[PDB]
Design a protein around this ligand. Structure first.
Ligand SMILES: *[C@@H]1O[C@H](CO)[C@@H](O)[C@H](O)[C@H]1NC(C)=O
Lengths: 152, 131, 147, 131, 147, 132
């Protein structure tokens, strides 16, 4: 009972990430009672329990000598168990400012245990503090949401 | 093994018992024996598509006009070189000492030596000497 | 199963061991099996021995705009007896590009003994330690059995 | 649903079979399978509203600082002589404007020509023109 | 069915990392159908399935006031895309001590039977001699998820 | 009370081969008894030279290659020999006000006071130089 999706998105655009769900694709894997709703952009968990949920976010500078700021993932649970606006899992990655030394990429990983309800719909939202957001893109095949069950 | 039998353009589908399923939309495999197809490259933003993605091979990007490719496989774009610069393998580096460039997308010519020409003189990275 | 996840109570960056929320009626917190938190010693106590994937997470937030820099460190120490798990997070110095937060995650497999008491210690190179706080509900110690 | 039956100030305790247990110490629910942790207002934060089991606490800044961003996400020291408080924080007074006192607003320089007189000392970011 | 290896290497040298595999060593643990080939520098997985594979990379400044740039791990599967990859910035010496640098990544990998995983180090050197891998800290680990 | 406690330094309580006191494998040590595993031996490479070799009793210890000097506990890192500077616990810090150092690998002497000597200054002192 585990899943791993690969974000389709490449441009840094505020709003929810779309995901590759077909397990014939490299990196992607769905099993058990886990499923992706293409319309709502949500992973749907059938069997309840506690899961180790993790997401990964790699970014690449695509316009040499330009682009700075920050990019953020946020995992939101629908329906809202909290019923406030609080993210279940959250990550922020600094985009370094194009120095002579120059680092042209940026990683970020987080994971933790989440008690998930039956029929819980997990979705991920991208937000970005743009100072030339066009100069950076999501590294393709690298932005990943994954989980696996710990409770039997 | 069973999977080795499957060619390029397909994968050894382990969910549907080793059968050579074709690569789904937006994916490819340029070798045989693969258990999954790889995701097709997207050329968006500053990237334009140069070659479209088949199920054989991956797509390839070029830069939109006003920029130029840099690094292997056009890994990133760079804006076309300004007044005092010249385009190299490593990018728009500034003209060296004794050389200059007047126009955009140009080459580093050397300063006119007025001593060698008879007359008398200074130059810079973006302008020839006046004599 | 046999797993735990605690949520640090602390908000001010103060050198010394972190206190933890352990009541699983709290959001984020979960204890199961032979795992327990000793409120007096500030220690997680593992009953059944084995190998566990142990991970901790540390988010920080700038609370005084335009101020604060340096570094903050977690260290997981095992009693009875150098750190089993360790993490350091740089606090960026307040620039035009205002980067007002800082994450840090680490995890690995640890062979734990029966009745092992895990505790986490915070250390901080303060240059205006008052300008930064632990982000609430974000600093987390967790583990689950692999054996 | 069993849990929907439970109101605010409680949670649907899945360890003790769906029963509506009250929120434990330092926690709340304003609409849940668990109660959320109560906010702490420490350091540069003072508590504005205390944490009930209905709603979360809310912070204000200690005096000498002022709130910034939504929900008072962070504090900023009160704006000095030549500055003015904005949504984005203490920015400096623009050209042609000034601020005399702390925690003030950017008024424009008195034009003495329009008033009849002439300048005996010109204006600046922290002082009006003297006439 | 899990493993955790500890890199032997200390000097930052482009090329594949050698690993401690003897579980009498602290940190190291092999179980099940998992084994290390000392000649090829490869971890070898017997039973196929899906595993959570993670690696960790800590670095330490060894020449005070010197050294900057970047260091990268890459997990390659035998039999040009890396399965897992990580890069860690080495901060440039400044007033702030900043003498160390961590980096963690993990994800689920579907592994074949008899798959040989190997890890490759690459480094953008600006005084590569001024930094070393922190000993016992650079770690490759995995555990099976599929029954 | 415990099987493993019986095993001394230089060995470990091998839980794979039923509690037996196996010797520490290559490149490892244990300077106390009762340990379930041996610790990895330190490596002294790059700017580090080996001062003491790694036994199965104790860990190795490093010194710096010449031109540098140790710094912090266990020679945690090296530092290039001090130039107006003086070597402290915290590293080569500059000579304080009123003090100077002429030569490399030296000590911060104080400026010669010409008033106390009778004469008067024709040029003031500095961090790297003492003239009257
Ligand atoms: C022009 O600049 C160069 C700089 O190297 C200098 O050597 C040269 O003498 C300058 N011309 C004159 C007339 O001084």
């Amino acid at each position: 009972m585990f899943a791993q999706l690969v974000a389709q998105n490449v441009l840094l655009i505020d709003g929810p990430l779309s995901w590759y769900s077909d397990p014939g694709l490299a990196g992607v894997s769905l099993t058990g009672g886990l499923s992706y709703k293409e319309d709502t952009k949500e992973l749907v968990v059938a069997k309840a329990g506690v899961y180790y949920v993790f997401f990964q976010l790699e970014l690449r500078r695509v316009v040499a000598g330009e682009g700075s700021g920050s990019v953020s993932l946020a995992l939101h649970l629908q329906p809202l168990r909290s019923a406030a606006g609080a993210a279940a899992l959250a990550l922020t990655v600094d985009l370094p400012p194009a120095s002579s030394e120059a680092r042209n990429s940026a990683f970020g990983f987080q994971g933790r245990l989440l008690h998930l309800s039956a029929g819980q719909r997990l979705g991920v939202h991208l937000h970005t503090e743009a100072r030339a957001r066009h100069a950076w893109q999501l590294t393709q095949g690298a932005t990943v949401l994954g989980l696996f069950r710990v409770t039997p | 093994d069973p999977c080795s039998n499957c060619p390029a353009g397909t994968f050894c589908d382990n969910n549907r018992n080793q059968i050579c399923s074709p690569c789904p939309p937006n994916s490819f495999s340029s070798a045989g024996g693969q258990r999954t197809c790889d995701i097709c490259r997207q050329c968006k933003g500053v990237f334009r598509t140069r070659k479209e993605c088949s199920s054989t091979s991956n797509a390839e990007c070029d830069c939109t006009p006003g920029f130029h490719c840099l690094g292997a496989g056009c890994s990133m774009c760079e804006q076309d070189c300004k007044q005092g610069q010249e385009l190299t393998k490593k990018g728009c580096k500034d003209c060296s000492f004794g050389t200059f460039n007047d126009q955009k997308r140009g080459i580093c010519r050397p300063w006119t030596n007025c001593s060698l020409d008879g007359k008398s003189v200074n130059g810079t990275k973006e302008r020839d000497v006046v004599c």
